[PDB]
């Protein structure tokens, strides 16, 4: 093109973001969350509806932030190749941070199992705690997670090849698969023998599997918003970062559950 | 070659002031609490 016409554009690929209030809005919501839960833990607020309201404000502020970012990527078209490479690497580094949190939980488990305390009874699991059996329910959980991984990669390659109804059906099937995982995990927590207060086994067990449960609820939300954006034509054939982000999140959560399954059940029992 | 005074001479005349100045500066920077203990009552003076 000419020089007059080249003078009207960015001259550098990276996104020049408009000013937005959602950082200070999410920050104020997070402060009110921390304050209200520290005042409701110790009886200074009577009931939990304040903490419920603070969680609701934090959620809606995060949703409005994500609404602005899908607006900038879809309608404003500000995500070029450099910005796409940047948000891909940024999601990769956040995923590495969550993996390291789970490494901390695995350190707590391996310490409290390799050094069995004398009040527990010098055996892992402790005396009186019947462990969760591996083969009954978590085998079903881990095979539907592995099939969720196969289903997201089938739906992603069906998206790249152009086929719409195969990719939509793949993303719908894998979203219902991981909510079947969430439901089976809630069922396992409902009919389980020990509590979170039942010593360090219940402590680190429900800590690790509950943090993974929380990440799978987050992946449920991400697969839902990705199904909505694929249904309403937001995702192209060569331009989609929400999908690549959600499927690398799916595979990392699958690997975390594989390690959680093998250690916490096949080595815990 | 070797025009002038030797390197031993013309660098010793720079170093021998600097050894004494460095010893003074470090003995102030490290041995200042000796003055507080010296004037202190725990020397019984």
């Amino acid at each position: 093109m000419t020089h007059l016409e080249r003078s009207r554009h960015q001259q550098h690929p990276f996104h020049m973001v408009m000013p937005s209030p959602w950082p200070i809005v999410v920050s104020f919501a997070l402060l009110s969350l921390a304050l209200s839960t520290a005042l409701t833990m110790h009886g200074y607020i009577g009931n939990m509806n304040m903490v419920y309201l603070a969680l609701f404000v934090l959620l809606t502020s995060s949703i409005l932030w994500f609404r602005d970012i899908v607006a900038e990527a879809t309608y404003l078209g500000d995500h070029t190749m450099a910005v796409r490479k940047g948000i891909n690497l940024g999601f990769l580094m956040f995923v590495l941070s969550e993996v390291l949190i789970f490494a901390g939980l695995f350190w707590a488990y391996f310490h409290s199992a390799m050094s069995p305390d004398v009040t527990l009874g010098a055996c892992w699991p402790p005396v009186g705690i019947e462990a969760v059996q591996p083969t009954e329910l978590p085998l079903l959980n881990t095979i539907i997670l592995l099939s969720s991984g196969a289903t997201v990669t089938y739906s992603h390659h069906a998206l790249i090849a152009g086929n719409r109804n195969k990719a939509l059906s793949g993303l719908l099937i894998t979203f219902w698969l991981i909510v079947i995982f969430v439901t089976c995990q809630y069922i396992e927590y409902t009919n389980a023998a020990f509590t979170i207060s039942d010593g360090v086994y219940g402590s680190v067990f429900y800590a690790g599997t509950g943090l993974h449960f929380l990440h799978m609820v987050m992946l449920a939300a991400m697969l839902g918003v990705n199904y909505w954006r694929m249904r309403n034509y937001h995702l192209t054939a060569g331009h989609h970062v929400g999908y690549e982000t959600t499927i690398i999140y799916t595979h990392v959560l699958d690997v975390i559950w594989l390690f959680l399954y093998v250690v916490f059940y096949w080595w815990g029992v | 070659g070797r025009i002038g005074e030797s390197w031993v001479i013309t660098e010793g005349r720079r170093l021998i002031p600097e050894i004494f100045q460095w010893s003074a500066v470090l003995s102030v920077c490290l041995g200042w609490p000796g003055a507080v203990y010296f004037f202190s009552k725990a020397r019984k003076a």
Partner: protein, 59 residues
């Protein structure tokens, strides 16, 4: 429904902030602002009773 081209036209042809450019923006934005103001006014309001010692009455 493929509103992507039409929303590209609406969003690029607008002198409004980015959270206001959709036609349904007020429908989210007004109750969110009211609920946010309440949710950040109240736990700050419960700090004098926290530093005073008055726990919440169990009624």
């Amino acid at each position: 429904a493929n509103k992507v081209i039409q929303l590209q036209k609406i969003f690029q042809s607008s002198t409004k902030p980015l959270w206001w450019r959709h036609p349904r923006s007020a429908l989210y934005l007004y109750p969110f602002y009211a609920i946010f103001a309440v949710a950040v006014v109240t736990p700050l309001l419960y700090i004098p009773n926290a530093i005073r010692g008055i726990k919440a009455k169990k009624a």
